[PDB]
Enzyme design. Sequence first.
Site, PDB file in Angstrom:
ATOM      1  N   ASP B  39       0.844  -1.185   0.000  1.00  0.00           N
ATOM      2  CA  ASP B  39       0.000   0.000   0.000  1.00  0.00           C
ATOM      3  C   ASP B  39       0.887   1.246   0.000  1.00  0.00           C
ATOM      4  O   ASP B  39       2.116   1.159  -0.057  1.00  0.00           O
ATOM      5  CB  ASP B  39      -0.944  -0.020   1.201  1.00  0.00           C
ATOM      6  CG  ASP B  39      -2.001  -1.108   1.102  1.00  0.00           C
ATOM      7  OD1 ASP B  39      -2.381  -1.471  -0.031  1.00  0.00           O
ATOM      8  OD2 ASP B  39      -2.448  -1.601   2.157  1.00  0.00           O
TER       9      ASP B  39
HETATM   10  C1  LIG Z   1       6.651  12.089  17.978  1.00  0.00           C
HETATM   11  C2  LIG Z   1       5.131  12.185  17.880  1.00  0.00           C
HETATM   12  C3  LIG Z   1       4.667  11.733  16.498  1.00  0.00           C
HETATM   13  C4  LIG Z   1       3.453  12.560  16.088  1.00  0.00           C
HETATM   14  C5  LIG Z   1       2.400  11.656  15.457  1.00  0.00           C
HETATM   15  C6  LIG Z   1       1.201  12.490  15.015  1.00  0.00           C
HETATM   16  C7  LIG Z   1       0.699  11.959  13.677  1.00  0.00           C
HETATM   17  C8  LIG Z   1      -0.825  12.010  13.637  1.00  0.00           C
HETATM   18  C9  LIG Z   1      -1.354  10.694  13.070  1.00  0.00           C
HETATM   19  C10 LIG Z   1      -2.872  10.767  12.925  1.00  0.00           C
HETATM   20  C11 LIG Z   1      -3.248  11.654  11.741  1.00  0.00           C
HETATM   21  C12 LIG Z   1      -3.991  10.794  10.722  1.00  0.00           C
HETATM   22  O1  LIG Z   1      -4.503   9.785  11.072  1.00  0.00           O
HETATM   23  S1  LIG Z   1      -4.127  11.289   8.979  1.00  0.00           S
HETATM   24  C13 LIG Z   1      -5.359  10.185   8.222  1.00  0.00           C
HETATM   25  C14 LIG Z   1      -6.157  10.954   7.175  1.00  0.00           C
HETATM   26  N1  LIG Z   1      -7.283  10.150   6.722  1.00  0.00           N
HETATM   27  C15 LIG Z   1      -7.498   9.891   5.307  1.00  0.00           C
HETATM   28  O2  LIG Z   1      -6.746  10.304   4.498  1.00  0.00           O
HETATM   29  C16 LIG Z   1      -8.689   9.053   4.861  1.00  0.00           C
HETATM   30  C17 LIG Z   1      -8.562   8.686   3.395  1.00  0.00           C
HETATM   31  N2  LIG Z   1      -7.556   7.639   3.274  1.00  0.00           N
HETATM   32  C18 LIG Z   1      -6.947   7.373   1.977  1.00  0.00           C
HETATM   33  O3  LIG Z   1      -7.302   8.019   1.049  1.00  0.00           O
HETATM   34  C19 LIG Z   1      -5.881   6.282   1.785  1.00  0.00           C
HETATM   35  O4  LIG Z   1      -6.309   5.097   2.392  1.00  0.00           O
HETATM   36  C20 LIG Z   1      -4.528   6.698   2.369  1.00  0.00           C
HETATM   37  C21 LIG Z   1      -4.584   6.645   3.894  1.00  0.00           C
HETATM   38  C22 LIG Z   1      -4.180   8.115   1.930  1.00  0.00           C
HETATM   39  C23 LIG Z   1      -3.429   5.742   1.901  1.00  0.00           C
HETATM   40  O5  LIG Z   1      -3.651   5.302   0.592  1.00  0.00           O
HETATM   41  P1  LIG Z   1      -3.470   3.694   0.279  1.00  0.00           P
HETATM   42  O6  LIG Z   1      -4.814   3.015   0.369  1.00  0.00           O
HETATM   43  O7  LIG Z   1      -2.908   3.502  -1.107  1.00  0.00           O
HETATM   44  O8  LIG Z   1      -2.525   3.089   1.288  1.00  0.00           O
END
Ligand SMILES: CCCCCCCCCCCC(=O)SCCNC(=O)CCNC(=O)[C@H](O)C(C)(C)COP(=O)(O)O
Lengths: 52, 83, 82, 58, 111, 77, 127, 147, 120, 97, 536
Positions: B39
């Site tokens: 992925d």
């Molecule tokens: C040191 C401390 C570290 C800090 C960490 C903080 C980080 C924050 C983490 C939480 C933020 C999130 O979840 S950000 C999550 C945002 N949500 C989405 O984007 C929903 C739509 N998802 C998609 O379009 C795809 O599934 C995709 C995922 C792009 C992949 O593509 P593939 O299907 O091809 O793998």
Amino acid sequence: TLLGAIFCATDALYENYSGKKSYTSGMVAGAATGAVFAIGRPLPQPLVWPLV
Amino acid sequence: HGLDRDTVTERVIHVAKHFEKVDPNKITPTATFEELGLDSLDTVELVMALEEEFGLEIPDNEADKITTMADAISYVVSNPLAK
Amino acid sequence: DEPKHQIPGNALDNWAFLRTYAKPLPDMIHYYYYVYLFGFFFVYKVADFPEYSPRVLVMAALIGSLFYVRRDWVHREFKDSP
Amino acid sequence: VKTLADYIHWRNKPSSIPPVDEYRPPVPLVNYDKLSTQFFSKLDNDPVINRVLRAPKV
Amino acid sequence: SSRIAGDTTGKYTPNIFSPETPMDRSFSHVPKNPFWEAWVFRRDNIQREFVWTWQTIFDLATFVGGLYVAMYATASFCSRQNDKRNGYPERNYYFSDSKSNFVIPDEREFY
Amino acid sequence: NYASLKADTSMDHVFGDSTNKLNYDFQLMSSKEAFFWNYTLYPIVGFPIFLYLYQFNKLENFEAEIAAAKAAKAASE
Amino acid sequence: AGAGGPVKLSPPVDKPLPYNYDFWMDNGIYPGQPIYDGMFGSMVGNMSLEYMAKGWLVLLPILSAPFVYEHCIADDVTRNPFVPRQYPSEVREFLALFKNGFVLNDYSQPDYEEMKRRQSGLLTPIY
Amino acid sequence: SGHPNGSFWSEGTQVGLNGFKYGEIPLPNGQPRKKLWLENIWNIGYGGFFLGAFCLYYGAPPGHVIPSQWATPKAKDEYAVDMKMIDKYNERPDLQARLSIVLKDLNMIEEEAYDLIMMRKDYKVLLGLHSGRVPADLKAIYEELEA
Amino acid sequence: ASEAVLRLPHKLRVMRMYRTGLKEIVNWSYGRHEFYPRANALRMEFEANKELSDREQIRKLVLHGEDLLARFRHWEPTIRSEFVGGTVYGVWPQHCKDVKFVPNPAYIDEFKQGDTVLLY
Amino acid sequence: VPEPPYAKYLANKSHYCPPDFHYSREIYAPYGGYFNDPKGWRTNTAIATLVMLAGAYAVFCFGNAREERLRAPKGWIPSQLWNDNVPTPVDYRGKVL
Amino acid sequence: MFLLAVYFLFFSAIANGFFGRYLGVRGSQLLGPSALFLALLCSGTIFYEVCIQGCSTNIKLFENFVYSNELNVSASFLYDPLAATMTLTVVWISCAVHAYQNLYMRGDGSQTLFTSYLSAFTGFMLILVAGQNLVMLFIGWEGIGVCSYLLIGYYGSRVSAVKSANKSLIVNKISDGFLLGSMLYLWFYTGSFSYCSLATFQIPDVVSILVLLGAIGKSSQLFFHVWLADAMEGPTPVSALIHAATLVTAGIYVLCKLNLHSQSAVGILGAATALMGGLFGLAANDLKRVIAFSTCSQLGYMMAVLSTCDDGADFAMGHLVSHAGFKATLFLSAGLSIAKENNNFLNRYGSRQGSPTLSFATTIASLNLLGFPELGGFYSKESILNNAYINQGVSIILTLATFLTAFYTSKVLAQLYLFPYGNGRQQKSFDIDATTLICFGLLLSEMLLRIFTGSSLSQNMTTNLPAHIKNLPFWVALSGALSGLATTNLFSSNFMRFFGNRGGFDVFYARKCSNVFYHNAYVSYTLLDRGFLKLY
Ligand SMILES: CCCCCCCCCCCC(=O)SCCNC(=O)CCNC(=O)[C@H](O)C(C)(C)COP(=O)(O)O
Ligand SMILES: CCCCCCCCCCCCCCCCCC(=O)OC[C@H](COP(=O)([O-])OCC(O)COP(=O)([O-])OC[C@@H](COC(=O)CCCCCCCCCCCCCCCCC)OC(=O)CCCCCCCCCCCCCCCCC)OC(=O)CCCCCCCCCCCCCCCCC
Ligand SMILES: CCCCCCCCCCCCCCCCCC(=O)O[C@@H](COC(=O)CCCCCCCCCCCCCCC)COP(=O)(O)OCC[N+](C)(C)C
Ligand SMILES: CCCCCCCCCCCCCCCCCCCC(=O)O[C@H](COC(=O)CCCCCCCCCCCCCC)COP(=O)(O)OCCN
Ligand SMILES: CCCCCCCCCCCCCCCCCCCC(=O)O[C@H](COC(=O)CCCCCCCCCCCCCC)COP(=O)(O)OCCN
Ligand SMILES: CCCCCCCCCCCCCCCCCCCC(=O)O[C@H](COC(=O)CCCCCCCCCCCCCC)COP(=O)(O)OCCN
């Protein structure tokens, strides 16, 4: 004539009020005369004419 | 030191094996990550694991351009700091 | 090519401003004649002027210098109009 | 009253105007660069941060 | 494409007709950049962009004239303290209006 | 003649591209802020000046008060 | 390998330079830097000056709490359960001369007041 | 790595010129380089300046170049005289009272008593005594301490 | 988030967030042993919201994660020494060829070297 | 590029020089080149050591002439072997040695 | 005999830096260490004569170095008990570092120039220490400043290194300006520059503040500590010398030589510096930076002890000379670790087969830093902590500083040895020759001799304190060590970030002081002389 009148009048009025003959009377009369010279004039001139 | 393609291929294939989903024969010197079953979030981990393997820092914009087994090997070969 | 000073204004507008100096030029004897005559009479009258304070004399000189108009300034700006 | 003040070239306006387009030196990229102006914030004790950093057993 | 101009033996001749470029002092000259040259020209001729604004007057007065006023006040205070220290009468300084003529101490006198 | 304005892209893949630029406007502090910080830091620089001023004022005031009390004591007596 | 490592060369200037470009220090290697780091550009840790001032505002009262008690709240009699070191008269008189001495706090002594006024000495030379 | 032959005390691996000093190329046959026009004149003139400066600084009699060198013996004699006089002043308390009166008229504090003993032969005291500014008692006080 | 991160497409933006988060896990750790559980936790944090299709909620998650990654930028990034920002970057940079060296400089027109005053 | 004729007069890359490192061999520096190791270095070091010891002898004479001890040492000091102006030692009690 | 050591060091500097073409890289690798070994024998003779046998000597090289009217100063050397001890410590450490640089700097182009800088650097330290008058001290002070400028910025193709050198130069310039003011005060009202006639029982506060402001520069205290952390850009042998003896200790030596300090200022500044240095060393992730912040903390202890008691000057000097040893060992071992792992970050260090000598030296130096009982550092630190009980505010802050010091010291030890291997699978190696072993043997001999000989005469003199008060520092150090081994979290992420930025002292300078400096420059030039006063 108006500029010279301001100069002389301010000079005499300052000397009478101060009661002493000093540089300051001439500087103040000149400052007033130069202020009258630069009533509506652009920015450097409000400073330069009172000084001159 | 310019590292030859054959060694770089062996080490990139070695790194790619550790994903459980990827089947050990699908990985070839010329295969895209999609056919392997990886992925986008997996490709992140593979690019990072390539960074530990060859002891290099991939600047991010090039990291996006790595989507295949082939171009990753090409990028590693291009790098003169690759170990 | 070398770095050069920027010249404010358009070329043709500046040239048009400069062309306003090309006007019929009077001869300077006319000014000189009157200045000579009135200056002679003025020097005769000055000996009769009251003695003025140095401060007033300097202020009068300053006012005269500020009020003096260069002959070129009238040349460029003269209009034969009401 | 025509006076010297009218014809003296007073520095009221810039003779030279700098060029608009200006060189900005190249710099290494920081992906996320928003400034932290709050010493105490909810972000430090955010549930995601707790799950990602504090919670996992080491 | 290049040749050695200098001769230590003393038999030096400048080959102005030589096909090969001499390695003279101009060989090591810095190539130079067009925009750096214009930056140098702009920076030297910064008086062109000088404009009298209230902000400019404010800055000039507050820093330059302010530092002059502060230094003059400090120097006057130090002179007053030194006059008290030395035992001299208050000295007739130029802008101080003092009804005393003491300027230079007499070496012969005991103060 | 002039140096070439074309950059070298040989090491971009190793060390990153030069696309990202500085966000600085290359402008100085505002006049109002500069006034405050000059008139704050410069006094801190001149800390001996204020110490000397304080002690001299204290000395002169004590001397004058002694003189006044001396005048009072020498008037009645 | 310390010597001979690859480096990136900074691109040549291709646009009009800002007047205050002297604030940028570039030796020809790619990562040029401000004359003083933190004057402009990226901030280490993405922390502004306001954040640091607030942190210091939190710290200073706690750090200053031990010092303020002894210096201000406490007094020579109650600072310590003992008097300063007792010396023979000839030694004590010399040691009491030092403005930075430790026998100036002997409240048992009959010269305590003069010793305390000596300790709080002149700010500047009178002459 | 290591040392070239494995021994630290082995002959250097570099033969030739490490660099070109002043940028000059060694002549093929070992022919000496022709000397510059200014070398002889420059060396003679500046070496002459420095040698003359050395000779004049050290050769010259005391007081010719460094005036303080002349004063050193005179200061020794004056130091002996001042030592004797200050020692006498400390012993005699009657002289201390008289010099106390002399000091006050001269607007001097008592601790400056040693100073007055050290300015016996100086423009200020010598001429003030003649003019009348300095009390004439100071002459007798000086003499009572062997001048 | 910087301008370059914002201009990126959604897929690459989430990829950037994951890469920066992993690097910041490396920076804030005390050793490699801390890295693996925290990396799995970040894995699960991204996997939890991958199937959301509501654009507005996804924008909220991306923005909040970008703020979190901005706040937890380490004062001291762990960078390999030979790369930009590294200790040994530029210590003794390899010097290039084609250097302009003037041989026997003082013997080029030795008598007549100097500045001249030219006049009209 | 065909190396210039003067390259023969210039010296080679030393054993300590990394093979990858390139430096311009024409540049002259008083502290030495980029990796040095000249031929005849052993004799130069011997000469330097001889000069060091001769200067040490001169400095030793000067210092001994100008070394002033105005207070007696508490015990025997090594300087008594070479300088005769050391005051006779007196111990903490006050007895002379 | 007393002059010989300075001659040997300056001869090494001249020989390596001016005739290094003839000597060569090997020629430096002999003439440096041999000359400093001879200087070590001379310094040992000096130490035995002056300290143990109480025989101070004065050597006047020449008179009238400056002779203008009454102002008269001479080039003279007085070896008093303080000077002999500092001379011995400095020469011992510098000989060790010169042995170290033979293998460490072999991969560096100018090894001869580096050796020459190191030897002149030591020579100027000895000139500062042994000067009989204030002017000789100023000469040594500025010499060490310029040598630090030429050593920190050794890597000129790195913008960070040259900017670090500029930072050091500017901060030290401000400090010696204050010192020159205090020097002029002392000449005017005492009649001389010599320390003998320098003595004043009562001094006005301005002179004391000027002396303290000058001292806090080199001995990096608060508001003047910015340069020490940035001084990591230089090569490892430079860091060992500057942090162990030459630069940091000079302010403490000046404060001890002339007791014109005020108790209230020194104690507060020292305790604040110790606490802040420990807190900053908590956040740091470079191996080399943690040791610099620890140097800051130890300097804070030494400055604090002056306020406590009359013996505070002796205690400060004893901690100074004890600290030089294990701190120099810590830098040298850290530098070897960096070379072997090709890394500077504590995360990627780990357990790996190595030399028993280096690991033992690191362990023993860190134990001395922590306060492990019956060690040279332990005695010199308990002498400070136990005697600081009378100053309640100082004592508390120093005890918390001991806790923090224990925590980060134990964390560094666990990360370097106990932790699993953290670096990559690449061929990395630094094989150590017998010369480096002789270096670490010299440091270990210094550490061992410190236990038997002691640091101060009143080291084991009783401080009449209850047992639970006297043995408290050990418990605080043990608790800090145990918490450090567990690698627990002590502060919230906000305060950890605050400490990682070192309190934001540099960001304040950037945003306000430097901008005001260059706005003053803008007003002076652009607005005024190239503006208002420039013709069209
Ligand atoms: C040191 C401390 C570290 C800090 C960490 C903080 C980080 C924050 C983490 C939480 C933020 C999130 O979840 S950000 C999550 C945002 N949500 C989405 O984007 C929903 C739509 N998802 C998609 O379009 C795809 O599934 C995709 C995922 C792009 C992949 O593509 P593939 O299907 O091809 O793998
Ligand atoms: C019907 C007939 C018409 C005439 C009517 C009057 C007839 C005459 C009657 C009696 C005449 C005798 C008295 C008249 C004055 C004597 C002059 C004269 O006769 O010479 C022949 C003259 C022609 O000679 P020319 O050779 O063909 O012309 C030469 C010029 O190049 C001419 O070429 P130009 O015009 O192209 O160039 C002019 C140039 C020529 O230069 C001059 O004009 C020189 C004048 C300098 C002062 C003169 C000395 C002043 C001493 C006065 C003494 C009395 C007071 C004592 C105490 C004073 C202490 C100073 O000056 C300028 O560029 C313009 C500036 C003018 C003054 C410059 C000084 C400025 C100082 C102010 C500073 C403030 C600025 C600060 C801000 C700046 C920002 C950066 O005829 C006249 O001009 C007479 C006109 C009468 C008008 C004068 C108005 C005031 C008179 C009294 C005031 C005194 C000040 C002088 C002002 C200017 C006078 C020229
Ligand atoms: C006190 C009595 C005894 C005096 C002895 C002093 C010790 C040696 C004095 C030698 C003369 C001092 C001035 C030497 C010239 C100054 C320039 C210099 O020292 O170094 C030059 C070049 O060095 C030389 O060629 C000559 C140096 C020979 C020995 C220098 C010893 C250190 C100087 C002592 C400091 C002077 C003290 C002045 C203040 C008291 C430049 O070095 P960098 O800028 O670091 O660049 C070098 C290249 N690299 C980037 C790779 C580092
Ligand atoms: C060539 C001199 C021209 C002055 C140039 C100054 C700069 C020009 C800017 C124009 C400003 C107007 C001129 C003011 C200058 C006077 C100085 C102010 C000092 C002051 O106010 O004290 C007065 C006396 O000083 C005085 O008025 C007499 C002082 C004389 C002025 C200073 C002379 C040397 C200056 C030369 C500088 C370099 C020359 C380049 C221009 C008051 O005194 P008071 O008696 O009234 O007591 C008060 C009892 N009511
Ligand atoms: C148009 C151009 C001008 C417009 C803008 C001008 C604005 C500037 C005005 C403020 C300038 C700073 C303040 C100095 C002047 C204060 C008022 C003058 C009156 C005065 O002399 O009072 C003395 C001020 O203290 C002092 O002795 C001086 C203390 C301040 C100096 C130290 C602060 C800055 C330090 C930076 C270094 C500069 C000095 C270096 C030596 C103390 O009264 P007194 O007891 O002396 O009796 C004297 C009887 N009036
Ligand atoms: C242990 C002994 C003491 C150690 C050092 C302690 C220093 C304590 C000083 C800080 C505590 C009080 C701070 C003042 C209260 C301000 C609180 C909010 C801050 C604020 O809003 O503005 C800030 C002003 O900078 C400022 O706040 C600068 C004020 C600092 C006063 C000078 C004291 C020296 C400080 C040196 C270290 C402190 C670093 C952090 C201040 C940021 O300004 P901006 O950049 O956003 O402005 C915009 C550019 N147009």
